[PDB]
Amino acid sequence: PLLKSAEREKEMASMKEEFTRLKEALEKSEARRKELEEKMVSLLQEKNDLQLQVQAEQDNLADAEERCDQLIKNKIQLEAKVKEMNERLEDEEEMNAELTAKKRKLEDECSELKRDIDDLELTLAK
Amino acid sequence: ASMKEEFTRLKEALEKSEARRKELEEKMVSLLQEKNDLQLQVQAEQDNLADAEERCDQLIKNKIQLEAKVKEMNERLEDEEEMNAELTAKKRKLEDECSELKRDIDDLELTL
Ligand SMILES: [Hg+2]
Ligand SMILES: [Hg+2]
Known part of the structure; x- marks a missing residue:
């Protein structure tokens, strides 16, 4: 432009x-x-x-967590029951042992008594 | 603007x-x-x-193991309990035999 x-x-x-x-x-x-x-x-x-x-x-x-809580209280009661049961078992077994001892000593005595009764019948008879 | x-x-x-x-x-x-x-x-x-959750499962397994152990013991205890009762009865029958035997020995000794 x-x-x-x-x-x-x-x-x-x-x-x-x-x-x-x-x-x-x-x-x-x-x-x-x-x-x-x-x-x-x-x-x-x-x-x-x-x-x-x-x-x-x-x-x-x-x-x-709350579920663990209940479980743990439950484990507590159960462990207490095991302790208790084991104590009773020992008592039972011990007593059992003791009774077995007495029953056997009584057995030795019936043996001896029947023997002495027989000796006196020997003394008497002849 | x-x-x-x-x-x-x-x-x-x-x-x-x-x-x-x-x-x-x-x-x-x-x-x-x-x-x-x-x-x-x-x-x-x-x-x-x-x-x-894992700890829950260990407790649940443990809970089961214990309840079983308690049960086993309850039954075992009952057997011991019955075992001792049967012995007590036997012991007692023998004691009554001693009584009777001692009496027979007494009667034979009076014959002499
Ligand atoms: Hg838990
Ligand atoms: Hg006896």
Whole structure:
């Protein structure tokens, strides 16, 4: 063009591209911002959902633990019963031994008595 | 407005946008720490629950072993209890034989 029409058209073409560039810089920034807005929303929901699993698992451990408690009180009563039964067995066995001894010594005496009765009948008879 | 105010509006919109983004980038760092920690915590707790459950099973097996041992002993005790009672009866019959025998010895000795 001629000097003046070229200079005028040049400034207009420059302002259009400068504008177009600012517009795109904004669009891009907005995109990054939007992607983050979405990520932050998703993470907060993820975090709060885990805070509930922690609670829930802690509760299951509480129920598991309480079950151990009952079992342990039960083991206590049972070990007490074993101790007690073993004591009685010893008493029984000991007594049994003692009775068997007395029954045998009585047996030796009936042997001897029947023998002495026979000796006196020998003395008497002849 | 004029072209200059339109550009000024755009620069400010960008500065604002970029600023909001810095807000998010910094707030996110701390947010991920929290999420990773809670994820590891749930794994830790699940491990505890498995170990707790395992202790339950050992106790249950032990409980069974004991109740059985108690039963076996109750029955064995009853046998001993009956065994001693039968002996006591025998011992007693013999004692009465001694009594009778000693009496017969007395009667024969009076004959002499
Ligand atoms: Hg348990
Ligand atoms: Hg006797």
